[PDB]
Write a protein that binds this ligand. Structure first.
Ligand SMILES: *CCC(=O)Nc1ccccc1C(=O)Nc1cc(CCc2cc(OC)cc(OC)c2)n[nH]1
Length: 271
């Protein structure tokens, strides 16, 4: 494996810990890195480390190398999981990335749901979550990157409650129609998923198309039907969800427009 002077981190400055909230990102452990911030080379920081299983194939290795190479070119953004360094020489490949201690957005909202039945996570807090994801997506789009699985489960939450998009590069209920069986994947198909993600945010980690079996979905969408306004959702946000769900990909808003619209709601929204 080649040595990249810009990214190589010494493995003896990395002490591996417990797996990160169990498998959903394929062999990721929490770790303590020493001198990750070169200003204070003595200082310890909590990081995430992606590696391969002992049973991994040649393809599995090439896939991790490709992911590492894409993360080297993407640059930095506060609302994405950023590459911190790599351990490639004299040992197994280690991909050091940012740690999001509070886990995925879905579980984050589900745990903060109001107890008991309807007869602590206000609208500005929810719009903040959405705005942050839209900004991370607008960034990734500018770096020629299409997600392919933009769901609340792929948005990670840090100790500082910052939203971070993970796993950028079937989850049928988040997929745009043109990707369902024409098998596309564009920036417009990411906007469709962003609309489903808005619905998950305002339902506080609710499962989309509740009750509808995965096979009945394609017909539902072909008839022009979409999910109804969640019980506690600002009308402007349902309007945005509906624009993300246009059948024609060219009719959907761009992540730039979504950022603009989400900002106005963030400033104005009550409750
Ligand atoms: C199942 C998801 C989940 O909820 N996980 C979780 C639960 C409780 C606490 C923490 C977590 C968690 O997964 N934290 C976490 C993972 C990561 C890095 C994941 C990752 C993302 C990439 O994006 C392209 C790339 C790589 O490595 C190549 C790893 N950080 N914090």
């Amino acid at each position: 494996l080649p040595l990249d002077p810009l990214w190589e981190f010494p493995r003896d400055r990395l002490v591996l810990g417990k797996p990160l909230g169990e498998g959903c990102f394929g062999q990721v452990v929490r770790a303590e890195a020493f001198g990750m911030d070169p200003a204070r080379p003595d200082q310890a920081s909590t990081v995430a480390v992606k590696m391969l299983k002992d049973n991994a194939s040649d393809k599995d290795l090439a896939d991790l190398v490709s992911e590492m190479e894409v993360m080297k070119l993407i640059g930095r953004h506060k609302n994405i999981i950023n590459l911190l360094g790599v351990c490639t020489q004299e040992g197994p490949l280690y991909v050091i990335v940012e740690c999001a201690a509070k886990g995925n957005l879905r579980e984050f909202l589900r745990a903060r749901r109001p107890p008991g039945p309807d007869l602590p996570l206000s609208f500005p807090v929810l719009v903040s979550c959405a705005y942050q994801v839209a900004r991370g997506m607008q960034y990734l789009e500018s770096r020629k990157c299409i997600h392919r699985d933009l769901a609340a489960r792929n948005v990670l939450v840090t100790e500082d409650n910052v939203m971070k998009i993970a796993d950028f590069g079937l989850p049928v209920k988040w997929m745009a129609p043109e990707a369902l069986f024409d098998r596309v994947y564009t920036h417009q198909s990411d906007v469709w998923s962003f609309g489903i993600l808005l619905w998950e945010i305002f339902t506080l980690g609710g499962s989309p198309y509740p009750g509808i079996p995965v096979e009945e979905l394609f017909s539902l969408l072909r008839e022009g039907h979409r999910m109804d306004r969640p019980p506690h959702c600002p009308p402007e946000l349902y309007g945005l969800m509906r624009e993300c769900w246009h059948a024609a990909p060219s009719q959907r808003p761009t992540f730039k427009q979504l950022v603009e619209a989400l900002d106005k709601v963030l400033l104005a929204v009550s409750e």
